[PDB]
């Protein structure tokens, strides 16, 4: 298991391509019927930043939960005493790209709980192994992970 390099993404294709996470289906807003498809992840082994104080970071698709929960296990196995951390889940802040998978609960930005940047390349490798459809070492401060839409699986 080798860490991802800075700015590396796996698989080595664009996020929205068929081999990776696939196309953006459309923004999910709070006042929408599709908002009801999102449920909060309440995993005790995951830290949610929730700087918004809204619980938005917990909201994600079922497939996102499944891969994130597997990742929570491997993180603790890799570094005893450390946990998976989520800085961004579903987003309504507009704090991502124009057509971000965050806007429909298909992406998370993650760190370790100790916010040790030196662990993030390996964290990214763990996210690949946990089954995320696309993983990108997007900034010095976080790893972006995403999944296929529910109706693509």
């Amino acid at each position, epitope marked *: 298991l080798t860490p991802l390099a800075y700015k590396q993404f796996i698989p080595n294709v664009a996020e929205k391509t068929l081999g990776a996470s696939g196309r953006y289906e459309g923004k999910i807003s709070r006042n929408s019927e599709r908002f009801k498809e999102l449920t909060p992840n309440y995993n005790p082994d995951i830290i949610f930043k929730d*700087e918004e104080n809204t619980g938005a970071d917990r909201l994600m698709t079922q497939r996102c939960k499944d891969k994130l929960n597997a990742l929570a296990i491997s993180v603790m196995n890799q570094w005893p005493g450390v946990k998976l951390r989520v800085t961004e889940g579903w987003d309504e802040d*507009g*704090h991502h*790209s124009e057509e971000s998978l965050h806007y429909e609960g298909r992406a998370v930005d993650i760190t370790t709980s100790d916010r040790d940047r030196s662990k993030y390349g390996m964290l990214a490798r763990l996210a690949v192994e946990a089954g995320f459809d696309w993983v990108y070492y997007e*900034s*010095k401060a976080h790893i972006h992970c995403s999944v296929k839409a529910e109706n693509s699986v």
Partner: antibody
Amino acid sequence: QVQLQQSGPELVRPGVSVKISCKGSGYTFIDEALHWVKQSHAESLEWIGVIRPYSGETNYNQKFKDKATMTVDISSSTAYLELARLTSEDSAIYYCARDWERGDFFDYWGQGTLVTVSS
Amino acid sequence: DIVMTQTPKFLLVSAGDKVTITCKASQSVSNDLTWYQQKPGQSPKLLIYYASNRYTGVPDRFTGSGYGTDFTFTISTVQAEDLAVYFCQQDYGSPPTFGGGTKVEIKR
């Protein structure tokens, strides 16, 4: 409402040190990194360093390693920048600025502190 | 350290005209490029990050593009309130470094 409030302008004699402060409000202070940036007019913006209140970790620009010391007081939500052995080169505006855990770039800035080095 | 060379140093523009500012890195900075706006007597304000993402609240008239070494900041139709010094900044390499600024002045 996120705010970084800096201490007022300073007149300091050459060779002496100056300590300037930056108080954060409207967010959980311990939770975000705080950076210091110098602005003159001839070298406009220069990154001095960063302190991470949550870990106590500091990283300095090598250009400022001998000059600057960054500290925090978590109980009062205040970061401090101490610049030692001041010369004319040190007269400038100094900002504190917060990152938002997306990389080393800054969403909220303090109002700046003007330091004038003079006898 | 990575040097960011920003051009032009100054622009004089009528409200409604296009503004194009260029930032060139001495070596690749991937997409780790930020643009700030600094209005007279104010602290810098974040406008664009990751080379092309508009920050929240930032008007549609402001865009960024580029990847690697060549970056462009555009105001499509400049407004009277956009008078400011604009700066690029990279954070790919350590330390983070800024361009020298472009002063946008308004003709009327």
